[PDB]
Amino acid sequence: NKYKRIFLVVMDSVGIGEAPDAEQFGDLGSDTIGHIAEHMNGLQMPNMVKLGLGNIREMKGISKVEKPLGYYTKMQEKSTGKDEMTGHWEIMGLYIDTPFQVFPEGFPKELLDELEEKTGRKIIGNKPASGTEILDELGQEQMETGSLIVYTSADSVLQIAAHEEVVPLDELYKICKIARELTLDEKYMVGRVIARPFVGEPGNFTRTPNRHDYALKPFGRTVMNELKDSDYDVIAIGKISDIYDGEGVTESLRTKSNMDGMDKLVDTLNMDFTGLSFLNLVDFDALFGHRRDPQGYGEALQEYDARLPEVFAKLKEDDLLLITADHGNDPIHPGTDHTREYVPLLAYSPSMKEGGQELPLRQTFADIGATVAENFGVKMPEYGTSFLNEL
Ligand SMILES: [Mn+2]
Ligand SMILES: [Mn+2]
Ligand SMILES: [Mn+2]
């Protein structure tokens, strides 16, 4: 092995400017990091700058350095969609023709009609909403009628809420399984169906930890699958295990925040493993990008950057750190959807004594997957070109 451990960090939604095909998606002008930097009157990310973020692209407060710690370039998404699954699945060596859909105006009547026909239940709601908002509005009617509250987020999900005393958990799970079957259809391709049971009285409803998720497996065996099958460790941190529906995962560490994500990364640095530690920092996307909150997004990026020196200190000569993103989600852009953007790529090992250089632009996110596979001597993915030898 060239490297014994690879630490892969997806800064979720942290895009570095509109991709060549951004027009198709209505994403002309999109620039996640750049617009955040302008909002902040300069972003304070000195550690990402030291790695060479500014060498990829100069933005307000983010300048190039003469000697970046590691190698740098950006990646272009090759798959059709810009959704949560597509980006991650491509990173791990796939190509995804069929995008997952989002539903800013709610689900098509055809889909909801079939769900009603199959379940014998009425559906109410059918809108994007937080768990709290939707229960405040509809919790009581749901309790009184035995209907189903169906709602969505800004991502590709169909959520079904029902009071635990009115709809038994096992019946709610059965319904979600029906909904999962109906949404494997490119007319309304849903990434994840989520059971959202709740308890309480009107004006005091709370969602319970009896949530169950119904996700799709990646459309192909991934580099994670190949690592696991070759007896390597694959440690998933945050939503990673969920994103891949556990495929190729040997250990999964739940996280509650970006700072907690960095704590778990540090935990894995302290573990003797051989293979991949794979972190998703999701706050950027979930709390700030979708909510179009550039101030909060900027603060989160500064908080993340300040955690990096400890990571640098713990990396060994045979460790490789890869930092990237999965799509954009520009907090100063119309609507609530992701933006089609290039993503940054930083590749650092303390064994890089002369520092790094610019890499050729990665024509698919799958170049990460290919690099990981080549490093560990496992079957190469169908897509992606390794940059291992460039490091
Ligand atoms: Mn757009
Ligand atoms: Mn994402
Ligand atoms: Mn998202």
From Swiss-Prot:
It is found in: Cytoplasm. Pfam families: Metalloenzyme. GO terms for cellular component: cytosol. Its main location: cytoplasm. InterPro entries: Alkaline_phosphatase_core_sf (IPR017850), DeoB (IPR010045), Metalloenzyme (IPR006124), Phosphopentomutase_DeoB_cap_sf (IPR024052). Mn(2+) 1 binds at residues 12, 326-327. This is Phosphopentomutase. The lineage of its organism: Bacteria, Bacillati, Bacillota, Bacilli, Bacillales.
